[PDB]
Amino acid sequence: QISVRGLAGVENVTELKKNFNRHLHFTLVKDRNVATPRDYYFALAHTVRDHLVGRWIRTQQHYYEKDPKRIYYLSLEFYMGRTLQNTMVNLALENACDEATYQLGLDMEELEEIEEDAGLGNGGLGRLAACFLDSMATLGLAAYGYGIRYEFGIFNQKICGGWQMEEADDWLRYGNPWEKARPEFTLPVHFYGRVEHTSQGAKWVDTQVVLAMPYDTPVPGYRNNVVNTMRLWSAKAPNDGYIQAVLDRNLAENISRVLYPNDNFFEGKELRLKQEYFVVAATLQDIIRRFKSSTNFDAFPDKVAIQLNDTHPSLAIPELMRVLVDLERLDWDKAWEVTVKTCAYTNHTVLPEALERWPVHLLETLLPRHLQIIYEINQRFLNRVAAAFPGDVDRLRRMSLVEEGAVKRINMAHLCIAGSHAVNGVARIHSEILKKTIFKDFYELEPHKFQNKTNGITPRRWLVLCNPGLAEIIAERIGEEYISDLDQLRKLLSYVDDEAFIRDVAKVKQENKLKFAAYLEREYKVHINPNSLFDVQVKRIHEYKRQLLNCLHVITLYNRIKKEPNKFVVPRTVMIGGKAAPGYHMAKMIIKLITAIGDVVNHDPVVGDRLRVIFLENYRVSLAEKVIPAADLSEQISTAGTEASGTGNMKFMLNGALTIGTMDGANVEMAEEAGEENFFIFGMRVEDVDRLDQRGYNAQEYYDRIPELRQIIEQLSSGFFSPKQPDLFKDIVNMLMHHDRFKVFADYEEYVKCQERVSALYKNPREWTRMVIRNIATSGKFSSDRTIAQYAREIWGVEPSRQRLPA
Amino acid sequence: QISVRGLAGVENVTELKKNFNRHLHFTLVKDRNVATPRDYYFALAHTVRDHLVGRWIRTQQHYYEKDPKRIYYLSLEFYMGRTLQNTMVNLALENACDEATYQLGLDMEELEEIEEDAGLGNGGLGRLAACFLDSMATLGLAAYGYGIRYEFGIFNQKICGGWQMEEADDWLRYGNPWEKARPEFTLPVHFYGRVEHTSQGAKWVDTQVVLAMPYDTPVPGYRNNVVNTMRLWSAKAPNDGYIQAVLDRNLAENISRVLYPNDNFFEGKELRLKQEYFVVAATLQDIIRRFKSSTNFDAFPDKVAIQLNDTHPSLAIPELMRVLVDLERLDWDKAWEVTVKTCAYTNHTVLPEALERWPVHLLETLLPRHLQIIYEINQRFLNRVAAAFPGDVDRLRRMSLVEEGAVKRINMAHLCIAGSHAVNGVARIHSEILKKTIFKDFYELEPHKFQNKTNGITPRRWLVLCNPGLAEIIAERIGEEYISDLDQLRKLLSYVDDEAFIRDVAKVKQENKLKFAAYLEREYKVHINPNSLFDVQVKRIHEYKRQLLNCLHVITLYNRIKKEPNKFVVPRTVMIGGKAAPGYHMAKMIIKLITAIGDVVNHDPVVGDRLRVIFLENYRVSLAEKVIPAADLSEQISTAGTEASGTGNMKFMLNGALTIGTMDGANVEMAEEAGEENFFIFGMRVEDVDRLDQRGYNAQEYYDRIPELRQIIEQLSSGFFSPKQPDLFKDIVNMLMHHDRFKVFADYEEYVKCQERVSALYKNPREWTRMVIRNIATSGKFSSDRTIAQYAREIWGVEPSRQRLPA
């Protein structure tokens, strides 16, 4: 149908059709008479998977022969989503599979909806790992993603009576055609035990063993025949009254059972610590095995890079030391030199409650040798600080890896900085804040260590796959090369006054909105006006992300309508979606508030179709691919200095939405690229937040001076949005009035005013679309290909390559 | 190589080779350079599996079209063993696969050894179900095997310091290529809750739900293109703080985790009760669904037969009533008529400790509605007894399904007789004992209900597969038809004086013994003399099976050698193998005794190679296929009246061993078929055991009157067989002297004398072999094809058919 989806050649279509039928018969053991749409999905999945295999085997043997430096990306999260369409796109099979399935009497889009998301992540950090895997394969790097194969990923979110309900994400129920179990490569991981000192060093003895079984998933590059590996570990009990002993195997296998869904507050839970060590210990054995199959560990950093995605795999640092010192018998200083040159650490937040600080007593019991190594790292590190800053005793206590107090803790971020040659933030403003605030002491000691690597998203999934209509109209003008070189989108600026292109951009958006409006009715029975402004905020529910500020605007619009009903206002569909961490009470209250506002707003006859408030249930990668192409306005309204980067912001920019946002995270660089005149910027900057903190933030002041804000707070308190439980939202009101860390009231006035400027522009479709074109055209910097190329050159010491491998 | 293994045509060999390579590449994701023998096994398994699929789909659709009466064989055990060779044999692919693999540079026999046994059973009862599945497919019956997919089958047995150690049988670790998961056909099973009475009958409410997910395994008939289904249920939790709730899913899924390995003593364990209901509830929903896809349940018994393998699935009876009465709204009397005509029950033991008697309080909590139904069945049944035998109050308490006492129990055997139209024993003597002793009252009420169905074994696995050499020399003389018509073996009697045939039979046995002698050295480092008499007792360790009597003979031979060292004795290799139930202390002591005897006997220089005692570790189906073809003497020495049938006895007879045994179980019919002169019969008959019980069994009498027996007991007591723990075997001595239920001493003298007659004949190879020929020639009755044909005609009301389906 469309050009960017590849060729539908007679020979390939014929071939796909027969392999589809072969799988339906031999693989699924079904005939056409009893086959369901799910059976047809699996037959297609296996057919497409066949095309990966040859390339997968030859890529991996190519690495064995040529022995390039290997990149190991360690993460507890890989938020992969669906694999079928992505595979077709990267292999140039989409039009051929569409044609083949059409000829068999099937709709491929319907078959695509059957696949479960691989939801092995919480949000941005997990999705970043997924985009990075795609870019690393596309750039021809010898890269491996290492993580945990959770049996249950992020919970499915049900909304019952306006409240979030969690249910198990049983994503493996019908099987996973993409993975290959490798039980032959199972490795032992040790826990507990004790440390024995002998003539020849320390020995870790009397341990309990858990087996780590790898499952490999192919990661195809974009049309370069490169297929890399994501290896995820599954926990297995070793084979050595009777009935109970067998049933107790579950205890060991619980390690890989479920993803921890708390993304707001660090809890030192033992099972989580086991998960973190499990991935680290199994992965490092793999790394060393592969290195030895190339005695001398001087070349180790020349052949290995380990990237730590946050501090979650930080135990890699003392584990590498343990292996080099205890097992390989290297002296401490040499082992440390190797470790530092091998490891690099990425930080994703400055919020203190989201930083890992493990109680010493847990590490003492679970990993006694690792604690000894950490103490030794700390002593040697603090000797360097003391020599650099003589007599500065407070610096010594501030920089210590060991935190004293009620309970002693290890600061995993401090461990990571000490043991890494590079530390990066994820957007320019974020990396600056790190140097000026929480890691200031470390920056003063080792300035060379600190870098910025602004985040990005893959334009394969986040344009070509989810928005083929926009990809096509772009390709008509400038060709197809931009898909792996997103900077080429700048060429679109010469079409900003092109009447045909303006109309096409606006047409693609309208089609996306109609399609999403139809999805909503079919799947959830909710009716929206497709001519309204699609006002979208989708992301995990957090106080810092300020879904509450959005809520206040929505109520303001409602109250204004009720005051002057016969006055014209630009119609809006306000959509808010995202999951809340199960133990995050305030986030769960915010979801309830959103639905409660909807219950009042959506049923007021005076409002009509001029304002609709919808909570988007079960927000996940597959839903993002649907809603983002349909959005007109992207809400990126975190308190300045709190959102390290954001990546959803970039997805919306690439897909033709305009952005309303604070000068926070990557928003700053986005506005810089597009021009501030083409962005809806409002609110306090970081410096204004700082000035307000020094003075003391008093929410009462805003309540007293803004009548419209007062009315909303009174409405909340009095039970206007909860008639049968008048005090339902008292926690929210109390927080806003007395202990709001994120200064919602302080940005209210400027936010509302900025929103009026948005409505004013939307009234002029031609100028709206021209501003959209200016955004899409300057979104090139935010490709994860750019991000990964910078990691490769500036941290890993390897050169990217767009050169194709033989098919 | 050999004729019975089929054709190796140029076209088939070429085809198998390329499909092997396709699976290695696309299915296993491996290249020849890194592939291991295990990879090669899996590639072959998938290639052979492909040939099943077409026939599997067409067999099942044929049943849907023709709608024949369906046979449902319900068992908690299916002792399947390995599947690869059996599949090749039944599909006539063995020579072709041998040739194809040879041309690829691989040894197929080596690849065969890689496959794990499906050890989903304990012993004879579980293996009977497996043989029955093979025969039902071979006889063209629309038969389904229904059971539980245990994650862990019968434990692997390790011997450490002479003691049995158990370890988990992780048979699914590398995957199972034979099964197909059918998650789309998952069904709910209910537990706990309470019973609510309404206007329209009872309702079972407030239950906990566990999901039953089916896995289907193909069961190919012998060269008839029939492929039936074995459906095994796996337990799954339904999808509806957070972390713990997810981890607690294990509780539900534990139902299908492990096979209970106690085959000696009934323990009323709750998890076992859950297993029994789980298989029954899921299976019956399947049966009813399939029946409704043919309102009127009058035709139900015309379209459905349910065979209960022991009382383990006895809950089928009240569950069928529950469904018909509570859900389908049939009146009680009609539902009962249907139930009785549908169900049949097979008994496998008369030993009271092995009979299921479930505590009322467990059933009350777990299955409250089923208990109500059982009580109602009992009241109506006892009203019939009272009308038939007026005033016989003791009969009423004897026949009750409810047993009064300290704890009230349900007698599941009584439930089965009441609710079945047919009750059978498993050998003629066994079925007679049932009528005369434990089920006498029931036989007097309903004589028509009671039948015999003498057990059998499949000649595919137990001759063609495990003993191809013997199968071939038989086929040379009489052709190949005997493989599915074992009675044709009678034609071999005209070759009893044929000098060529005598030599060939003796040659095949010698080759089998050399091969097994080599297996022992290679896998266990034990050295045996292949010219000795192979004296074999393999079966589960039980007091009734009297491995202890064998032990006493072995010590007698040793003591006789030590007394007269320079006297000639026929050299023997005495092999004893079998697992003991983990909680069966006496059985574990018996294993220790066997190894302890070996430790003394095998290292005495005076003995030389004249006597060797070996414990065969980890006895299982795959080991039986190796040792049975190598045996000269089959030990079948249970106390008369205790072994219901035996099936191992039949395996040895088919494979050219002579039998030493008591007149117990099927031994009686075996001796009848072969002629008593061609059997080594010794010991008390059932009547002699009865006379001894009435008198009172006093072991001291035998000790006092037999000097050779006294010496052995003194040796045991004094620590001759345990120098470092002199009192190690005190439990065994005490049992033998004071509380031996199985009268080991009473059969000692006749056993030893009979063993001398065996040695005398072995000294004359020609006459030994002629007696062997007489046994093989008359083993035809003991084919499970004969057994199943009798079930089909006399119980199920269906006609067998050797007619081939189109390929």
Ligand SMILES: CC(C)(C)c1ccc(C(=O)NC(=O)N[C@@H]2O[C@H](CO)[C@@H](O)[C@H](O)[C@H]2O)cc1
């Ligand atoms: C330590 C613990 C509380 C368990 C925890 C666990 C997970 C998270 C988590 O999911 N954390 C994020 O997604 N972090 C996100 O990372 C992306 C990518 O750089 C950024 O764009 C975004 O600004 C940042 O908030 C945060 C905290």
Ligand SMILES: CC(C)(C)c1ccc(C(=O)NC(=O)N[C@@H]2O[C@H](CO)[C@@H](O)[C@H](O)[C@H]2O)cc1
């Ligand atoms: C009730 C419980 C104690 C759990 C239990 C569980 C399993 C068994 C068990 O495995 N039981 C047998 O194998 N029984 C065997 O069945 C075969 C086939 O008919 C006969 O040849 C043989 O004589 C008989 O002992 C016996 C008892």
Ligand SMILES: O=c1[nH]cnc2c1ncn2[C@@H]1O[C@H](COP(=O)(O)O)[C@@H](O)[C@H]1O
């Ligand atoms: O020892 C070897 N000989 C030949 N190829 C090898 C060897 N080891 C690894 N490979 C290749 O590398 C791949 C496996 O890589 P690895 O398991 O990640 O180390 C396989 O697909 C092989 O093609």
Ligand SMILES: O=c1[nH]cnc2c1ncn2[C@@H]1O[C@H](COP(=O)(O)O)[C@@H](O)[C@H]1O
């Ligand atoms: O409704 C039907 N239409 C056509 N074939 C059916 C239907 N139901 C069952 N079958 C056939 O019967 C087989 C499944 O049988 P069942 O699941 O055991 O009842 C399938 O392989 C089909 O070929």
Ligand SMILES: *Cc1c(COP(=O)(O)O)cnc(C)c1O
């Ligand atoms: C991109 C993405 C995120 C991250 O969004 P932010 O607005 O940057 O927090 C979270 N969840 C999903 C499913 C995503 O795709």
Ligand SMILES: *Cc1c(COP(=O)(O)O)cnc(C)c1O
């Ligand atoms: C045949 C068989 C049995 C049954 O043997 P008996 O001597 O009849 O008890 C037990 N286990 C296995 C593995 C068998 O093959």
